[PDB]
């Protein structure tokens, strides 16, 4: 009783505290303003903004990102950032004013594969109770738009890449995927039950289950074809692409989606590796996300955990190698979309006595921070006096009206605190780190499918 | 040199002061917020608003103000408030759902009379230099829309009143008078020179001047008739008015503008007197504004100076007599148009250390406060425990969307500090005060034409 | 432009206090005193007032101090709040001067306290510029060829070296048919920086 009493909200206490707070001028001011406007709007520090909103970068890639892409109302950030990195290769080599790889192409296959992947996950977990943590998690959002870089390579290895001119964001569902996802997911939840019920009496290898699963794929594909068309050409089938360069000259390229990805997009699926700064685990260790994927039997989500100093130097190096850097972060934490600034001190929260001492590792464990979006670093500014990078130039996929012409500026501190993963090529890694991937000695730290360090959705 | 040096802005001093201010948390908070939003928007105190926005009034007139009037982009507040007071008499007696006296009718004649009045003022001051304080003041805004209650009676005595149904705000210039005023004023400034030049060699009584003045009236009238039509009937000419009551019954009234004002509007020009609270001068004294007027040879602007206790009791009494009260104040000082609240403590300026000790009398002398608008008190709330009024119900002429359905709530403190004049009937005054007007002993304190206690423009 | 705006308004507020002291012998309702009280912190100015500011404060790139604050692009409310305070101060000064001379330490202290309050209120709506007139600033920029450059200068040096402004050369000419041509025209009392150059025109 005494404990519960002491743990209760006492009316006298709160009213007494109120009197005390009201006697402080800063509090009087704070409560007046905070009842009138959104805290971020009220506390935006223009004195800080004046200095931090710096668009001068001494280390940039040679090719411009034209035009600015927009994923619209969908969680396709990762696909846009992954292709935004490769599109530059076509723009530069083919001397084009504007060019985009088809994001919709990868989106269609990703969603189809995920739906199929889900059916397999349900079969493999049919031994567990319906209310179990895993089964419930699988049923929560099976067709979500978000993904990881490994999931991106899985799709490219199987489907390749094609120019947006052949398959674009025309369908309503590519730019407003919520309803389509809802309709598919409702069906998948129905299917999960049909599968589990059938499995109570039969084994997964039973022809009855095999037939049931195929009928389900057929229905999923059928429903999907109503909202988006299956791409016009198969992965190994030839397509014809007509285009104009910057000199007004016409050219015709005949290729296959798979050849296009290697020959023109310059993507060698064997080179990219993901590095992450996850302070919850020791550095130098491999981190693996259990069950997360899209294409059945594809590569798993694996990261090499490294400290921020290493992560930062790798970003600078890749930029010097004339390559943009795919990265994941906690959007929209400390991100001002109007000005396009990512700075953890941009809002004067200390002025109202609001401070946050919880550290990165703990923020992750305590449900406070996670990877939610994927973006592209296309430049940075290295301090001349032998110092490290001070800020980074970031390309978003939210249209030209977001940030400054679609571009954002991120501080080094933000990168260290609210960013987690970067993608680089294995040849850019020191032999010390590269070996972690090449050798067969490394035993990965296996994390649950629900771990915060996952898909950039 | 030493004095000028000490009186100069020293760069070291301001930067030193800045460091000191920045060390204070309230200041840090204040400057962050104040660089983001308008001070009134930021400092609006909702804790105060919650209590002060009270629309319960125990002392109200019996007739509703329907419909809400809108002067639009013109300074016709005084005409609207003066007629808003009388319209209630027609609404009540004729059992009408909606009714308005023509504000445009009075507006047309007021502007014509003022233009003519100006010509006379120029003639009477032709002995003074062009750069003199008086002549320059006369040339500043001869056709301004604003006026006083005495100027209103001057027009009604000569022109009477008519229903808006016969002459409304149809013309562009009635609701957006700026351009029309500019065009007339430019002409009047030309005329002022022609008159003064002609007077250098001739006396005002010279037939040449008399002819010149008439030609000027003709041109002023001609230009005015281009923007508004002269009313359809003369003051002593009969008009026919058809209307419908609340019971859907049709009626026809045949009258003249002059008869209508007395018979239907119930206005006896001999009864209204203006009282004012001008702490610069002793109470019990008559105050007169030199040269201010509209109709040549009309009544002057005269006020009986009384204390706030007297002013307040008179407002309560008139309301109990079932009559609304015409009043002038300093709009938009401490007036929140969105909520329709007039309260000097509604914004938390003390929170940023912004306090204003300057008293009413001094605020007037120091160019800080003056009469700028005319409104109508249609109710008030008298505290039951033998106390005085706590708040007043105010009708504005800014449309139904301003304030709360066009209505505002004003505190007693606001009335005492930012209001100056009220209009009551002489029979409502104690014999002590009524005698000030009736006897011929009272010598008025004569103020300059430019005095802050003037026209509600 | 904000750089000059901040200092101009501060100087004008201070200038006003001096104008009030110098005219304390005149009645409150006099033409001059009333004119001084009408709009002491107005945004407008003359070219001579511009040179006054540049001579004392110099110039800096907008990249270091721009129109971010609400009051730079909607100055009315800020002006109203400052002016209301200045009108209060005008009375406090005139009242104190009825018994004491302007040189009295009491007046000198009063005036300084007033400057402090004016500056304090101003710092709430705009920040004092990041560098002092003779203090060095660092400016990073990109040319038309995409090349990066770093300029280290002071506001005063920047105005001469980069903006190419020599304060001794500009003169104002005016066409005022009210007066004979060839004559110099001077506007009495108009200014911003106390003791700065006057508004003079050659007709």
UniProtKB/Swiss-Prot annotation, chain C:
Q: How is it modified after translation?
A: The N-terminus of isoform Cytoplasmic is blocked.
Q: Which domain of life is it from?
A: Eukaryota
Q: Which family does it belong to?
A: Belongs to the peptidase C1 family.
Q: What else is known?
A: Present with 521 molecules/cell in log phase SD medium.
Q: What is the recorded function of this protein according to its Swiss-Prot or TrEMBL entry?
A: The normal physiological role of the enzyme is unknown, but it is not essential for the viability of yeast cells. Has aminopeptidase activity, shortening substrate peptides sequentially by 1 amino acid. Has bleomycin hydrolase activity, which can protect the cell from the toxic effects of bleomycin. Has homocysteine-thiolactonase activity, protecting the cell against homocysteine toxicity. Acts as a repressor in the GAL4 regulatory system, but this does not require either the peptidase or nucleic acid-binding activities.
Could you describe the subunit structure of this protein?
A: Homohexamer. Binds to nucleic acids. Binds single-stranded DNA and RNA with higher affinity than double-stranded DNA.
What is this protein's name? Cysteine proteinase 1, mitochondrial
What species is this protein from? Saccharomyces cerevisiae (strain ATCC 204508 / S288c)
Query: What gene is it encoded by?
Result: LAP3
Q: Which residues of the full protein are shown?
A: 128 to 330 of 483
